[PDB]
mmCIF file of C-alpha atoms in Angstrom:
data_model
loop_
_atom_site.group_PDB
_atom_site.id
_atom_site.type_symbol
_atom_site.label_atom_id
_atom_site.label_comp_id
_atom_site.label_asym_id
_atom_site.label_seq_id
_atom_site.Cartn_x
_atom_site.Cartn_y
_atom_site.Cartn_z
ATOM 1 C CA UNK A 216 205.349 123.870 172.377
ATOM 2 C CA UNK A 217 204.442 127.643 172.558
ATOM 3 C CA UNK A 218 201.468 127.812 169.981
ATOM 4 C CA UNK A 219 200.726 130.243 167.842
ATOM 5 C CA UNK A 220 198.857 133.244 168.707
ATOM 6 C CA UNK A 221 197.456 135.862 166.944
ATOM 7 C CA UNK A 222 195.966 139.371 168.859
ATOM 8 C CA UNK A 223 192.927 142.086 167.261
ATOM 9 C CA UNK A 224 190.875 143.870 169.005
ATOM 10 C CA UNK A 225 187.182 143.321 170.244
ATOM 11 C CA UNK A 226 185.398 146.426 172.243
ATOM 12 C CA UNK A 227 188.086 148.961 174.032
ATOM 13 C CA UNK A 228 189.921 144.763 174.969
ATOM 14 C CA UNK A 229 192.540 143.529 173.572
ATOM 15 C CA UNK A 230 192.956 139.371 172.412
ATOM 16 C CA UNK A 231 195.881 137.521 172.433
ATOM 17 C CA UNK A 232 195.019 134.377 171.608
ATOM 18 C CA UNK A 233 196.672 131.634 170.592
ATOM 19 C CA UNK A 234 195.071 129.972 166.946
ATOM 20 C CA UNK A 235 193.208 127.280 168.875
ATOM 21 C CA UNK A 236 190.073 129.482 169.563
ATOM 22 C CA UNK A 237 188.334 130.820 166.721
ATOM 23 C CA UNK A 238 185.397 133.667 166.157
ATOM 24 C CA UNK A 239 185.559 135.084 169.157
ATOM 25 C CA UNK A 240 182.733 136.644 170.574
ATOM 26 C CA UNK A 241 182.671 139.257 173.563
ATOM 27 C CA UNK A 242 180.474 138.066 175.765
ATOM 28 C CA UNK A 243 180.695 140.658 178.965
ATOM 29 C CA UNK A 244 182.732 142.810 181.813
ATOM 30 C CA UNK A 245 183.517 143.006 184.701
ATOM 31 C CA UNK A 246 185.257 142.738 187.835
ATOM 32 C CA UNK A 247 186.321 138.880 187.009
ATOM 33 C CA UNK A 248 187.664 140.179 183.513
ATOM 34 C CA UNK A 249 186.385 139.870 179.408
ATOM 35 C CA UNK A 250 185.055 137.065 178.166
ATOM 36 C CA UNK A 251 184.112 136.031 175.184
ATOM 37 C CA UNK A 252 182.718 133.288 173.399
ATOM 38 C CA UNK A 253 184.433 130.531 171.439
ATOM 39 C CA UNK A 254 185.394 127.806 169.129
ATOM 40 C CA UNK A 255 188.125 125.494 170.515
ATOM 41 C CA UNK A 256 189.671 123.819 167.648
ATOM 42 C CA UNK A 257 191.367 121.676 169.428
ATOM 43 C CA UNK A 258 189.467 119.620 171.595
ATOM 44 C CA UNK A 259 185.849 120.739 169.527
ATOM 45 C CA UNK A 260 183.978 122.842 172.239
ATOM 46 C CA UNK A 261 181.827 126.010 172.654
ATOM 47 C CA UNK A 262 185.559 127.519 175.090
ATOM 48 C CA UNK A 263 184.447 130.850 177.364
ATOM 49 C CA UNK A 264 188.279 132.518 176.734
ATOM 50 C CA UNK A 265 188.270 134.715 180.703
ATOM 51 C CA UNK A 266 190.981 137.421 179.974
ATOM 52 C CA UNK A 267 191.479 138.948 183.796
ATOM 53 C CA UNK A 268 191.188 142.088 183.990
ATOM 54 C CA UNK A 269 195.310 144.300 185.691
ATOM 55 C CA UNK A 270 195.647 141.039 187.524
ATOM 56 C CA UNK A 271 198.548 142.469 188.815
ATOM 57 C CA UNK A 272 198.325 146.317 189.401
ATOM 58 C CA UNK A 273 198.788 145.560 193.687
ATOM 59 C CA UNK A 274 199.794 143.017 196.436
ATOM 60 C CA UNK A 275 196.115 142.771 197.020
ATOM 61 C CA UNK A 276 195.499 141.722 192.987
ATOM 62 C CA UNK A 277 198.578 139.948 192.848
ATOM 63 C CA UNK A 278 197.782 138.158 195.416
ATOM 64 C CA UNK A 279 193.750 137.534 194.296
ATOM 65 C CA UNK A 280 195.276 136.443 190.798
ATOM 66 C CA UNK A 281 197.268 133.756 191.878
ATOM 67 C CA UNK A 282 194.748 132.576 194.420
ATOM 68 C CA UNK A 283 192.137 132.039 191.761
ATOM 69 C CA UNK A 284 194.618 130.512 189.704
ATOM 70 C CA UNK A 285 196.044 127.531 192.333
ATOM 71 C CA UNK A 286 192.044 127.181 193.401
ATOM 72 C CA UNK A 287 191.171 126.723 189.448
ATOM 73 C CA UNK A 288 194.634 124.460 188.367
ATOM 74 C CA UNK A 289 193.079 121.767 191.984
ATOM 75 C CA UNK A 290 189.512 121.397 190.332
ATOM 76 C CA UNK A 291 188.924 118.044 189.228
ATOM 77 C CA UNK A 292 185.254 116.896 189.010
ATOM 78 C CA UNK A 293 183.135 115.997 186.864
ATOM 79 C CA UNK A 294 180.085 119.215 188.398
ATOM 80 C CA UNK A 295 182.542 121.346 189.373
ATOM 81 C CA UNK A 296 184.017 124.291 186.401
ATOM 82 C CA UNK A 297 187.429 122.984 185.266
ATOM 83 C CA UNK A 298 190.477 124.541 183.633
ATOM 84 C CA UNK A 299 190.116 123.034 179.926
ATOM 85 C CA UNK A 300 192.749 126.025 179.607
ATOM 86 C CA UNK A 301 195.317 129.531 180.474
ATOM 87 C CA UNK A 302 198.179 131.086 178.831
ATOM 88 C CA UNK A 303 200.282 134.207 178.837
ATOM 89 C CA UNK A 304 200.480 135.294 175.969
ATOM 90 C CA UNK A 305 203.899 136.206 177.324
ATOM 91 C CA UNK A 306 207.669 134.235 176.408
ATOM 92 C CA UNK A 307 209.603 135.069 179.784
ATOM 93 C CA UNK A 308 208.832 136.661 183.058
ATOM 94 C CA UNK A 309 209.928 139.472 182.570
ATOM 95 C CA UNK A 310 207.115 140.466 179.705
ATOM 96 C CA UNK A 311 204.649 138.669 181.902
ATOM 97 C CA UNK A 312 201.130 140.858 182.145
ATOM 98 C CA UNK A 313 197.844 138.565 180.703
ATOM 99 C CA UNK A 314 196.351 136.143 182.432
ATOM 100 C CA UNK A 315 193.673 133.996 179.567
ATOM 101 C CA UNK A 316 191.533 131.185 181.069
ATOM 102 C CA UNK A 317 189.512 129.162 178.942
ATOM 103 C CA UNK A 318 186.366 126.841 180.509
ATOM 104 C CA UNK A 319 183.686 124.332 178.918
ATOM 105 C CA UNK A 320 181.615 127.639 177.593
ATOM 106 C CA UNK A 321 178.353 126.668 179.923
ATOM 107 C CA UNK A 322 174.989 126.898 177.250
ATOM 108 C CA UNK A 323 172.054 127.812 180.445
ATOM 109 C CA UNK A 324 172.072 128.201 184.423
ATOM 110 C CA UNK A 325 169.224 126.715 187.600
ATOM 111 C CA UNK A 326 167.477 129.587 187.070
ATOM 112 C CA UNK A 327 167.730 129.397 182.595
ATOM 113 C CA UNK A 328 166.665 125.390 183.307
ATOM 114 C CA UNK A 329 163.415 126.008 185.835
ATOM 115 C CA UNK A 330 162.040 129.931 183.263
ATOM 116 C CA UNK A 331 161.511 127.462 180.237
ATOM 117 C CA UNK A 332 160.272 124.182 182.424
ATOM 118 C CA UNK A 333 158.641 122.695 185.102
ATOM 119 C CA UNK A 334 160.664 120.422 186.583
ATOM 120 C CA UNK A 335 160.105 116.732 187.699
ATOM 121 C CA UNK A 336 160.814 115.140 191.429
ATOM 122 C CA UNK A 337 163.111 113.027 190.263
ATOM 123 C CA UNK A 338 164.914 116.438 188.619
ATOM 124 C CA UNK A 339 164.803 118.106 191.904
ATOM 125 C CA UNK A 340 166.504 115.047 193.769
ATOM 126 C CA UNK A 341 169.448 114.143 190.440
ATOM 127 C CA UNK A 342 169.981 118.966 190.805
ATOM 128 C CA UNK A 343 170.469 118.624 194.704
ATOM 129 C CA UNK A 344 172.503 114.848 194.569
ATOM 130 C CA UNK A 345 175.111 116.402 191.923
ATOM 131 C CA UNK A 346 175.568 119.684 194.381
ATOM 132 C CA UNK A 347 176.151 117.145 196.909
ATOM 133 C CA UNK A 348 178.313 115.508 195.184
ATOM 134 C CA UNK A 349 179.582 117.813 194.135
ATOM 135 C CA UNK A 350 180.788 120.189 197.745
ATOM 136 C CA UNK A 351 182.003 116.499 199.216
ATOM 137 C CA UNK A 352 184.699 116.818 196.428
ATOM 138 C CA UNK A 353 185.279 121.039 197.394
ATOM 139 C CA UNK A 354 184.808 120.308 201.639
ATOM 140 C CA UNK A 355 186.840 117.212 201.322
ATOM 141 C CA UNK A 356 189.804 119.678 200.164
ATOM 142 C CA UNK A 357 189.317 122.446 203.056
ATOM 143 C CA UNK A 358 187.618 124.706 200.387
ATOM 144 C CA UNK A 359 183.867 126.776 201.383
ATOM 145 C CA UNK A 360 182.134 127.394 197.646
ATOM 146 C CA UNK A 361 181.026 130.748 199.804
ATOM 147 C CA UNK A 362 178.248 131.980 197.276
ATOM 148 C CA UNK A 363 175.836 129.137 196.260
ATOM 149 C CA UNK A 364 173.279 130.243 194.454
ATOM 150 C CA UNK A 365 171.183 129.001 191.193
ATOM 151 C CA UNK A 366 173.036 131.108 189.061
ATOM 152 C CA UNK A 367 176.295 129.811 189.990
ATOM 153 C CA UNK A 368 174.859 126.357 188.663
ATOM 154 C CA UNK A 369 175.603 124.772 184.912
ATOM 155 C CA UNK A 370 172.637 122.932 183.511
ATOM 156 C CA UNK A 371 172.885 121.125 180.280
ATOM 157 C CA UNK A 372 169.931 119.355 178.293
ATOM 158 C CA UNK A 373 170.959 115.200 180.302
ATOM 159 C CA UNK A 374 170.166 117.408 183.593
ATOM 160 C CA UNK A 375 174.220 117.495 184.231
ATOM 161 C CA UNK A 376 175.261 119.818 186.758
ATOM 162 C CA UNK A 377 178.272 121.912 187.571
ATOM 163 C CA UNK A 378 179.383 124.443 190.206
ATOM 164 C CA UNK A 379 181.012 127.289 188.845
ATOM 165 C CA UNK A 380 182.269 131.004 189.858
ATOM 166 C CA UNK A 381 184.059 130.613 193.510
ATOM 167 C CA UNK A 382 184.328 132.740 195.844
ATOM 168 C CA UNK A 383 187.014 135.324 196.208
ATOM 169 C CA UNK A 384 168.815 138.095 195.196
ATOM 170 C CA UNK A 385 173.190 138.000 196.209
ATOM 171 C CA UNK A 386 172.237 137.440 200.140
ATOM 172 C CA UNK A 387 168.994 134.868 199.737
ATOM 173 C CA UNK A 388 170.776 131.928 199.250
ATOM 174 C CA UNK A 389 173.394 133.167 202.567
ATOM 175 C CA UNK A 390 173.723 131.269 206.461
ATOM 176 C CA UNK A 391 172.224 133.931 208.548
ATOM 177 C CA UNK A 392 175.924 133.277 210.555
ATOM 178 C CA UNK A 393 177.849 135.124 207.559
ATOM 179 C CA UNK A 394 175.259 136.819 206.343
ATOM 180 C CA UNK A 395 175.573 138.869 209.726
ATOM 181 C CA UNK A 396 179.238 138.069 210.059
ATOM 182 C CA UNK A 397 178.695 136.053 213.745
ATOM 183 C CA UNK A 398 181.547 133.325 213.768
ATOM 184 C CA UNK A 399 184.203 131.898 211.803
ATOM 185 C CA UNK A 400 182.038 130.173 209.747
ATOM 186 C CA UNK A 401 182.243 126.028 209.125
ATOM 187 C CA UNK A 402 181.427 124.318 205.017
ATOM 188 C CA UNK A 403 178.551 124.879 206.467
ATOM 189 C CA UNK A 404 177.780 127.998 205.079
ATOM 190 C CA UNK A 405 177.440 125.995 202.125
ATOM 191 C CA UNK A 406 174.912 123.391 202.573
ATOM 192 C CA UNK A 407 172.844 126.558 203.579
ATOM 193 C CA UNK A 408 173.106 127.557 200.376
ATOM 194 C CA UNK A 409 171.165 124.015 199.385
ATOM 195 C CA UNK A 410 168.509 124.021 200.985
ATOM 196 C CA UNK A 411 168.014 127.011 199.472
ATOM 197 C CA UNK A 412 168.985 126.428 196.500
ATOM 198 C CA UNK A 413 166.366 122.762 197.340
ATOM 199 C CA UNK A 414 162.857 124.711 198.790
ATOM 200 C CA UNK A 415 162.743 126.706 196.009
ATOM 201 C CA UNK A 416 163.230 124.553 192.945
ATOM 202 C CA UNK A 417 160.391 122.034 194.819
ATOM 203 C CA UNK A 418 158.153 124.902 196.005
ATOM 204 C CA UNK A 419 158.723 127.422 192.606
ATOM 205 C CA UNK A 420 159.187 130.756 195.286
ATOM 206 C CA UNK A 421 162.811 132.076 196.778
ATOM 207 C CA UNK A 422 162.692 130.935 200.537
ATOM 208 C CA UNK A 423 164.539 133.690 202.126
ATOM 209 C CA UNK A 424 164.021 136.635 200.074
ATOM 210 C CA UNK A 425 164.746 140.025 201.631
ATOM 211 C CA UNK A 426 164.943 143.089 200.901
ATOM 212 C CA UNK A 427 167.560 144.547 203.730
ATOM 213 C CA UNK A 428 170.146 141.785 205.696
ATOM 214 C CA UNK A 429 167.589 142.448 208.953
ATOM 215 C CA UNK A 430 164.331 141.436 207.225
ATOM 216 C CA UNK A 431 165.781 138.353 205.421
ATOM 217 C CA UNK A 432 167.177 137.856 209.174
ATOM 218 C CA UNK A 433 164.008 137.712 210.232
ATOM 219 C CA UNK A 434 162.569 135.355 207.989
ATOM 220 C CA UNK A 435 165.184 133.338 208.476
ATOM 221 C CA UNK A 436 164.517 133.612 212.019
ATOM 222 C CA UNK A 437 160.742 132.743 211.785
ATOM 223 C CA UNK A 438 161.410 129.265 209.718
ATOM 224 C CA UNK A 439 163.647 127.698 212.095
ATOM 225 C CA UNK A 440 163.178 129.195 215.457
ATOM 226 C CA UNK A 441 165.245 132.421 216.904
ATOM 227 C CA UNK A 442 169.256 131.105 218.358
ATOM 228 C CA UNK A 443 169.048 129.151 221.343
ATOM 229 C CA UNK A 444 171.611 129.918 224.311
ATOM 230 C CA UNK A 445 174.134 126.939 223.265
ATOM 231 C CA UNK A 446 174.508 128.837 219.779
ATOM 232 C CA UNK A 447 174.866 132.588 221.223
ATOM 233 C CA UNK A 448 177.745 131.069 223.591
ATOM 234 C CA UNK A 449 179.206 130.930 220.302
ATOM 235 C CA UNK A 450 179.007 134.598 218.658
ATOM 236 C CA UNK A 451 181.676 136.396 218.795
ATOM 237 C CA UNK A 452 180.306 139.409 218.735
ATOM 238 C CA UNK A 453 179.212 140.748 221.895
ATOM 239 C CA UNK A 454 176.394 143.414 220.488
ATOM 240 C CA UNK A 455 175.654 140.558 217.788
ATOM 241 C CA UNK A 456 174.231 138.109 221.338
ATOM 242 C CA UNK A 457 173.006 141.300 222.749
ATOM 243 C CA UNK A 458 170.853 141.359 218.836
ATOM 244 C CA UNK A 459 169.695 138.688 219.417
ATOM 245 C CA UNK A 460 168.688 138.411 222.918
ATOM 246 C CA UNK A 461 166.146 141.427 222.250
ATOM 247 C CA UNK A 462 164.519 139.586 219.466
ATOM 248 C CA UNK A 463 161.468 138.260 220.324
ATOM 249 C CA UNK A 464 161.853 134.582 220.689
ATOM 250 C CA UNK A 465 159.818 131.991 218.378
ATOM 251 C CA UNK A 466 159.384 128.389 217.707
ATOM 252 C CA UNK A 467 160.786 126.495 214.483
ATOM 253 C CA UNK A 468 158.780 125.886 212.923
ATOM 254 C CA UNK A 469 156.987 121.295 211.737
ATOM 255 C CA UNK A 470 158.131 122.422 207.908
ATOM 256 C CA UNK A 471 156.058 120.097 206.641
ATOM 257 C CA UNK A 472 153.157 122.864 206.997
ATOM 258 C CA UNK A 473 155.293 124.859 205.033
ATOM 259 C CA UNK A 474 156.171 122.780 201.968
ATOM 260 C CA UNK A 475 152.617 121.037 201.982
ATOM 261 C CA UNK A 476 152.711 118.627 199.080
ATOM 262 C CA UNK A 477 156.299 117.892 198.663
ATOM 263 C CA UNK A 478 158.262 114.633 199.152
ATOM 264 C CA UNK A 479 158.522 114.289 203.045
ATOM 265 C CA UNK A 480 162.124 112.462 201.970
ATOM 266 C CA UNK A 481 162.904 115.793 200.087
ATOM 267 C CA UNK A 482 160.837 117.889 202.841
ATOM 268 C CA UNK A 483 163.067 116.201 205.692
ATOM 269 C CA UNK A 484 166.619 116.527 204.415
ATOM 270 C CA UNK A 485 165.983 120.640 203.948
ATOM 271 C CA UNK A 486 164.834 120.380 207.730
ATOM 272 C CA UNK A 487 168.811 119.028 207.886
ATOM 273 C CA UNK A 488 170.013 121.310 206.056
ATOM 274 C CA UNK A 489 168.480 124.532 206.889
ATOM 275 C CA UNK A 490 169.245 124.388 210.500
ATOM 276 C CA UNK A 491 170.460 127.615 212.105
ATOM 277 C CA UNK A 492 172.852 126.089 214.175
ATOM 278 C CA UNK A 493 176.502 125.258 211.252
ATOM 279 C CA UNK A 494 177.441 122.787 213.522
ATOM 280 C CA UNK A 495 174.695 120.617 213.188
ATOM 281 C CA UNK A 496 174.205 120.826 209.738
ATOM 282 C CA UNK A 497 173.902 117.894 207.755
ATOM 283 C CA UNK A 498 177.426 117.599 206.211
ATOM 284 C CA UNK A 499 177.506 116.931 202.444
ATOM 285 C CA UNK A 500 178.876 113.134 202.492
ATOM 286 C CA UNK A 501 175.848 112.493 204.937
ATOM 287 C CA UNK A 502 173.306 114.561 202.959
ATOM 288 C CA UNK A 503 174.307 111.566 200.011
ATOM 289 C CA UNK A 504 173.415 108.287 201.941
ATOM 290 C CA UNK A 505 170.114 110.385 202.856
ATOM 291 C CA UNK A 506 166.994 107.966 201.404
ATOM 292 C CA UNK A 507 165.975 111.176 199.036
ATOM 293 C CA UNK A 508 168.844 110.627 197.139
ATOM 294 C CA UNK A 509 168.786 106.824 196.854
ATOM 295 C CA UNK A 510 168.412 105.955 192.897
ATOM 296 C CA UNK A 511 171.227 107.861 192.878
ATOM 297 C CA UNK A 512 173.719 107.296 195.505
ATOM 298 C CA UNK A 513 176.625 105.107 194.993
ATOM 299 C CA UNK A 514 178.644 105.713 197.599
ATOM 300 C CA UNK A 515 182.578 103.922 195.166
ATOM 301 C CA UNK A 516 181.761 106.773 192.622
ATOM 302 C CA UNK A 517 181.053 110.026 195.296
ATOM 303 C CA UNK A 518 185.160 111.457 195.182
ATOM 304 C CA UNK A 519 186.722 113.481 196.957
ATOM 305 C CA UNK A 520 189.849 115.864 196.832
ATOM 306 C CA UNK A 521 193.503 115.775 196.765
ATOM 307 C CA UNK A 522 194.571 117.425 199.671
ATOM 308 C CA UNK A 523 195.231 121.226 199.328
ATOM 309 C CA UNK A 524 197.449 123.506 200.325
ATOM 310 C CA UNK A 525 196.414 126.493 201.398
ATOM 311 C CA UNK A 526 199.551 127.759 202.774
ATOM 312 C CA UNK A 527 200.620 130.420 200.518
ATOM 313 C CA UNK A 528 197.556 132.570 202.373
ATOM 314 C CA UNK A 529 199.807 133.733 205.386
ATOM 315 C CA UNK A 530 202.696 134.340 202.953
ATOM 316 C CA UNK A 531 203.517 137.886 202.526
ATOM 317 C CA UNK A 532 204.997 138.846 199.525
ATOM 318 C CA UNK A 533 205.917 141.334 197.467
ATOM 319 C CA UNK A 534 203.737 142.548 194.529
ATOM 320 C CA UNK A 535 206.248 140.730 192.076
ATOM 321 C CA UNK A 536 206.872 137.436 193.142
ATOM 322 C CA UNK A 537 202.759 136.747 193.784
ATOM 323 C CA UNK A 538 202.982 137.926 189.953
ATOM 324 C CA UNK A 539 206.068 135.150 189.727
ATOM 325 C CA UNK A 540 204.799 132.563 191.240
ATOM 326 C CA UNK A 541 201.571 132.899 188.828
ATOM 327 C CA UNK A 542 203.482 132.815 186.256
ATOM 328 C CA UNK A 543 205.201 129.626 186.986
ATOM 329 C CA UNK A 544 201.708 127.982 187.783
ATOM 330 C CA UNK A 545 200.073 129.375 184.086
ATOM 331 C CA UNK A 546 203.964 127.860 182.675
ATOM 332 C CA UNK A 547 203.842 124.302 184.591
ATOM 333 C CA UNK A 548 199.956 123.467 182.972
ATOM 334 C CA UNK A 549 198.744 120.193 182.203
ATOM 335 C CA UNK A 550 195.791 120.253 180.405
ATOM 336 C CA UNK A 551 192.797 117.287 181.142
ATOM 337 C CA UNK A 552 192.554 114.003 178.755
ATOM 338 C CA UNK A 553 189.719 115.359 176.745
ATOM 339 C CA UNK B 35 168.139 111.999 183.105
ATOM 340 C CA UNK B 36 167.388 110.055 179.433
ATOM 341 C CA UNK B 37 164.792 112.628 177.558
ATOM 342 C CA UNK B 38 165.818 116.168 176.815
ATOM 343 C CA UNK B 39 165.846 119.217 179.400
ATOM 344 C CA UNK B 40 165.603 122.881 177.280
ATOM 345 C CA UNK B 41 167.075 125.024 177.107
ATOM 346 C CA UNK B 42 167.187 129.443 176.143
#
């Protein structure tokens, strides 16, 4: 059951794909690889076909390719990007060179939505709900996205949302304890991101649009107050604690003064997401039970994920061993039902 | 969500 492939050259890139993928139109390149928009004649969907660039040129890249394929193959949730297909033209491991990934082609991200209409409070509830729904699932497999932001959130005409682009304007949504490497971060780094996204959808302004890391950190600390003793004790870097102790202390602001005219339940949830100490931020699963989502919360329709074995991260392997493991993941892929 | 969001 190996498909028929056809080979063509678009840009300076060669594409060898099964003939089910028609009218390949290049949509750009980068470190993530070349991407073409295409038509999937088997499912009738428009898809993105992503060809990885140099997936096995180093130990580092070969392991990175394996990590990506394992992760994408595990994500099965209606609010998270899923893998429609993965393929190689190679008929054997010894021919194995190229990896292609296929996803549903996403027609608009959250920024494109905001540029075409004014969102209602109900739109915001549903968008944020779906982010938190997806995160509960991601976090339940001990995955941290690390890079939530509006450009990584796809939205369709029915206002249905999907989390895209798992990690490994760029800093504005990032938690302060990883923007400056204060500590080993938990998954509530993503909850901070959701807070920044939510505040921006409500006010129409970026919450913390700092230029450099320091300028940004001061805007954050102006809203949420400077770290107290309990948080300082959790910061590993002696230099970080010394920098923090040099700052003039600042109390937390009253958010109702910052977000005047927003649904008080929305403001209340933001207060629970944008807490400086990550150990006290609301989790995705708790946040779904917040009164703000009462129209959408359904405890029996907020699934968790299967356990995700990441013990490969501590394996020290040869470049061709990472390449062989990736090949197994390619040949063992089962497509989703439809 | 019933009425259609606008797409660019």
